[PDB]
Every structure is written in structure tokens, then in C-alpha cells.
């Protein structure tokens, strides 16, 4: 599923991401934008052999099981395929664990490089939330 901007903001809010660990909803939408362009089916292979899955490009090195990432963990206790669903629940629940891991949203390199310090509120501007 490719979400609309305000559509995703609404879903993220409904699943409790809005201000989760102090990160406003706009931070989350911005991260999703640059990670997956709002496409739940987005996958990308990493140089180390791990793969990133879903709207927030969650990495199989730590967070999910895909059966093909040697020496990895599955800290979210989910198959990486769950992160590709039209229903964002699994992505949100996993992202809450990731953002709690110590480095906050810096876990998402793209958030650091493209969202951090910017006017993230622009990402939810105009949305009925």
C-alpha cells in the first residue's frame, strides 16, 4: 500500500506514535517519506547482506527475521514480511522498540540526515488529525 501523507499521519497517530519517546508525528511522517516514500512494500538490500523492510525500512540485522541474514537478531519477534503489510501495526510496534534502544530516531540514518532539525511539522500541516 502506498499511503497518502495525511493518511499515514492519521494511522501513525491511531497506533500511538505521535509524540512517542518525545518525537512529534511530523518526525515519523518525514522518516517514512524518505525511507519508503510511504510504500509499505518497500525493501532494500544492505551491503552487509541484511535487508530493510516497510514504511520505516526496519533492518533484519536486529529487528526481524527473514531467514537470510547471518548472525542477526529478531528483537521485534516478527517475520520481516509482516513489515510489508497494508496494516502498519507491526511496523509501528517494532519502531517503538527501535526508537527506545538508546539513540532515539538517529537509528534511522535518513531521519538524521533529512528530517532532524528541519520543520517536520510541515509533514502533518493541513491534516485532519
Write out the binding residues for substrate. 101
Residue 50 CA to its chain's centroid (Å): 16
Q: How far apart are CA 103 and CA 98, in angstroms?
A: 9
Choice from 17, 69, 111, 124 touching Na ion (CB under 5 A): 69
Sheet architecture: strand order including 51-53: 43-45, 51-53, 58-59
Q: By rule CB under 5 A, what string of x and - marks binding of each residue 83-122 to Na ion?
A: x-------x-------------------------------
At 127, list the grid cell. 491534516
Choice from 31, 69, 90, 107 touching Cl ion (CB under 5 A): 69
Interface stretch with Na ion, choices 8-16, 26-34, 41-49, 118-126 (CB under 5 A): 41-49
Check if 35 is active-site. yes
Give the number of other CB atoms < 10 A from CB of residue 47: 5
Q: How far apart are CA 129 and CA 109, in angstroms?
A: 27
Which C-beta is closer to Na ion: that of 106 or that of 122? 106
Give the CB-side neighbour count of residue 9, counting CA atoms within 13 A. Answer: 20
Check if 52 is active-site. yes
Binding residues: 101
Which residues of the chain form contacts with Na ion (CB under 5 A)?
2, 22, 40, 42-43, 51, 54-56, 58, 60, 65-66, 68-69, 72, 74, 83, 91
Amino acid at each position: 500500500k502506498v499511503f497518502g501523507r495525511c493518511e499515514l499521519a492519521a494511522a501513525m497517530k491511531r497506533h500511538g506514535l505521535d509524540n512517542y519517546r518525545g518525537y512529534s508525528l511530523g518526525n515519523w511522517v518525514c522518516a517514512a517519506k524518505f525511507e519508503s516514500n510511504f510504500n509499505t512494500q518497500a525493501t532494500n538490500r544492505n551491503t552487509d547482506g541484511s535487508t530493510d523492510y516497510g514504511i520505516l525500512q526496519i533492518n533484519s540485522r536486529w529487528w526481524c527475521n527473514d531467514g537470510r541474514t547471518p548472525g542477526s537478531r529478531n528483537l521485534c519477534n516478527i517475520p520481516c514480511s509482516a513489515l510489508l503489510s497494508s496494516d502498519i501495526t507491526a511496523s509501528v510496534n517494532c519502531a517503538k522498540k527501535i526508537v527506545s534502544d538508546g539513540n532515539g530516531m538517529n537509528a534511522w540514518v535518513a531521519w538524521r540526515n533529512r528530517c532532524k532539525g528541519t520543520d517536520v511539522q510541515a509533514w502533518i500541516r493541513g491534516c485532519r488529525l
